[model samples]
Target: VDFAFELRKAQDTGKIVMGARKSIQYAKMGGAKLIIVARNARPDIKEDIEYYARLSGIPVYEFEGTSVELGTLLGRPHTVSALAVVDPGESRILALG
Candidate 1:
């Protein structure tokens, strides 16, 4: 899904999880569909996101603003420090048929 679609899906669900570093880790473990990193995120956080993205083949998008901007767009402004889009179907936590 594109950025807008991913963002909207996360918002509509009202369960948008956030945390730049943790998001990447979740994505790696097959617990996320989209991971958004803030433009000004710490270098270590940014590096970790990229590392997980490449390792897990999950797409990662960088929001061109602060964490606050991303949180606002996601509709859970206060609570959303960052987020990972969990894909229940694709989650590695589930065993395959």
Candidate 2:
């Protein structure tokens, strides 16, 4: 998958909720369509999101890069440990599975 390209496309054309806390909230509420977690994110955080995703039937994508790289891909200055994708727009990110 063209991970960076697809993520950027989603950010530009769709909707992304950036941050682990927000992602967790979305996951718990089953509001997000997909979950994106950084490769180097904390284990606890990953597990929590994964558990919630499983319950919510939402697909989770483990980003190939670290949080910093993901933030850079999104053209942001901060790290992005986890994020929730509410829409895919023209990006095929939802096809990762």
Candidate 3:
């Protein structure tokens, strides 16, 4: 996930999983295609993202906004550590769902 459009697409299609740390972990576990990271994300969170991204070879994108913005977009801030794009084969996840 290198752009908001990708993240939004994933969310719309239900391919996104919220949680920065968890997203990274899932990606590393081969459960995700992309990871959306918040620009205002905590240092520890950022570190985790980097680690997982590197280990998993998963693309990580940074949003120039807060987690709240990302969370609100996804309609779930608490689980929003990041958005993990799962199952890109579904067109719904690519559209506004």
Candidate 4:
């Protein structure tokens, strides 16, 4: 799949939450359907968020790229270590789940 295109579609049509802290919030709050983490993210932080994801039954996907590349996919100027998606809209990324 074209990760960039899919992520863009998610941005255009879905409900999204970005950043590690926000991801944990959504995951624990019961609205997170999925979590995507950059491979370059800090290990400690990744574990912290994923812990709550398990509690919420949210699946986590590890990106093959670094945080910088992940930022590019998400159309951001800064690095994004993690992002949580509550809705995927037209993006077929949910198939990955």
Would you list the C-alpha lDDT of every candidate in the order shown?
A: 0.62, 0.90, 0.66, 0.86
Cα deviation at 63, candidate 2, in Å, is 0.8
Q: Give the lowest summed-lDDT range of ten residues in model 3.
A: 88-97
For model 3, residues 1-97, the per-residue Cα lDDT tens digits are 3345555555566556667756876877978776667777888978888788778877776667888887776667353546667765443333322
Candidate 2 off by > 4 Å: none
Q: What value does the lDDT take at residue 55 in candidate 2?
A: 91
TM-score of each: 0.66, 0.94, 0.73, 0.92
TM accuracy, model 2: 0.94
lDDT by residue for model 1 over 1-97, one digit each (tens)? 3554546654565344578767876867867666667777778777888788668877766667777776677666363445666642323311210
How does model 1 fare in lDDT? 0.62
Q: Which candidate would rank higher by lDDT, 1 or 3?
A: 3
Which residue segments of model 3 deviate by more than 4 Å?
Answer: 1-9, 77-79, 89-97
Which candidate comes out best when scored by lDDT?
Answer: 2
CA lDDT of 58 in candidate 3? 78
Per residue, candidate 2 scores C-alpha lDDT tens digits across 1-97 of: 7988998998899999999899989988988989999999999988888898899898898988999998899899999999999888899878875
Candidate 4 residue runs with Cα over 4 Å from true position: none
Residue 65's lDDT within candidate 2 is 90
Error of 2 at 76 (Å): 1.0
Positional deviation of 50 in candidate 4, in angstroms? 1.2
